[PDB]
């Protein structure tokens, strides 16, 4: 069998058949065709994989995957004395941070130099972001239709250092990559929710407490990928999500394999009834990793005494507690095998991603 089954990639496109849309497009942007970067809705089918792994991939693609945004270097926004009094640096910085960019190079630096030498309110569009850094853009990284602030008559706006910054969307939401559009379990029967007696329920026939779904359909939307290269961009995004998950799991694996040597991430107590308690404390870790670890440890040790994790919003850490009727090294090797199971599952996911999209 194969885990990640066939994918459905359908970009979002401007329907020029609508007269108003085409008229407006040609009137203000002189636009007659599809934009260079379009949002793509990627709907995926997953079979024979636990809900924790699919949701972890979704969460990573949402905000835990590294991503690029346009930021202004401090001192970039020329305070000056002619600049528009309404277009504050904070406002324009917020506008520019959230312009989705498909940047393959970090060295690109843009400059915004717009002057309103007329009596009308001039609107600064994303097409006004001219680029002066390194390689000339063979293909644009952002759409030229974004509305940046307007200029009052006689006013200007000069921002000279607009560079590309790397980060994850969990820390700053301007790095969020994939927006959720669908999530369902295909192996759980659903009630007809349009009925009155089942309208207050979720719809699934199995209670979430007693349900263990293995067949899921996951739908995600990526906000801007190049139009001619949609499939390769989707492949890269999914493969990078799998790589990120594997890398973090391996970071946990190092703490596991250092179990005899002292370390404050992992402690071990043999409490009363031959049971050994392992507490794994990792800082700046999300529910994705803790949920993956809990689910796979529980799958590998069905008779476990207790496995649980908690990412308290404060203390900004993931604390995973395992209690088992086994000695310290037996428990450690069970946990190592469970991590190897996680790595195997996500490597198989990357293999399927390579096989499918192409």
């Amino acid at each position: 069998e194969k885990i990640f089954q066939n994918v459905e990639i359908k970009p979002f496109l401007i329907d020029f058949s609508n007269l108003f849309i085409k008229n407006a497009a040609k009137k203000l942007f002189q636009l007659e065709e599809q934009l260079p970067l379009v949002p793509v809705n990627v709907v995926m089918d997953f079979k024979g994989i636990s809900r924790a792994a699919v949701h972890g991939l979704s969460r990573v693609l949402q905000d835990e995957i590294p991503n690029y945004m346009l930021d202004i270097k401090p001192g970039g926004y020329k305070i000056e004395d002619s600049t528009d009094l309404f277009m504050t640096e904070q406002f324009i910085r917020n506008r520019i941070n959230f312009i989705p960019i498909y940047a393959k190079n970090e060295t690109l630096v843009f400059a915004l130099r717009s002057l309103n030498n007329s009596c009308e309110v001039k609107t600064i569009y994303s097409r006004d972001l001219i680029q002066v850094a390194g390689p000339k853009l063979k293909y644009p990284i952002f759409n030229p239709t974004f509305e940046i602030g307007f200029l009052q008559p006689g006013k200007s706006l000069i921002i000279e250092d607009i560079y590309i910054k790397k980060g994850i969307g969990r820390k700053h939401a301007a790095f969020n990559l994939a927006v959720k559009t669908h999530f369902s379990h295909l192996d759980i029967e659903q009630y007809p929710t349009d009925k009155k007696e089942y309208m207050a329920l979720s719809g699934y026939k199995q209670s979430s407490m007693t349900s263990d779904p293995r067949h899921h359909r996951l739908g995600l939307c990526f906000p801007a990928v190049p139009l001619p290269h949609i499939n390769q961009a989707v492949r890269t995004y999914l493969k990078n999500a799998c790589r990120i998950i594997i890398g973090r799991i391996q970071s946990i694996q190092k703490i596991y394999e250092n179990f005899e040597e002292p370390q404050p991430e992992l402690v071990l107590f043999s409490m009363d009834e031959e049971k050994t308690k392992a507490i794994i404390t990792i800082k700046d870790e999300t529910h994705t990793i803790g949920n993956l670890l809990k689910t796979y440890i529980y799958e590998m040790i069905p008779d476990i005494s207790f496995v649980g994790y908690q990412c308290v919003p404060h203390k900004q850490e993931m604390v995973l507690t395992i209690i088992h009727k086994a000695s310290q090294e037996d428990l450690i090797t069970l946990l190592e095998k469970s991590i190897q199971n996680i790595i195997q599952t996500f490597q198989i996911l990357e293999k399927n991603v390579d096989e499918l999209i192409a």
């Binding site: 000056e80 002619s82 002057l115 030498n117 008559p153 006689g154 006013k155 200007s156």
Partner: peptide, 28 residues
């Protein structure tokens, strides 16, 4: 004297219409 005129609002109006025509440099 300048602080009496530079904070006078009609000077900003007079300045901003000179910038539109280009009679004065855009900056200060």
């Amino acid at each position: 004297l300048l602080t009496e005129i530079l904070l006078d609002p009609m000077y900003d109006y007079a300045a901003t219409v000179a910038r539109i025509d280009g009679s004065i440099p855009m900056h200060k």
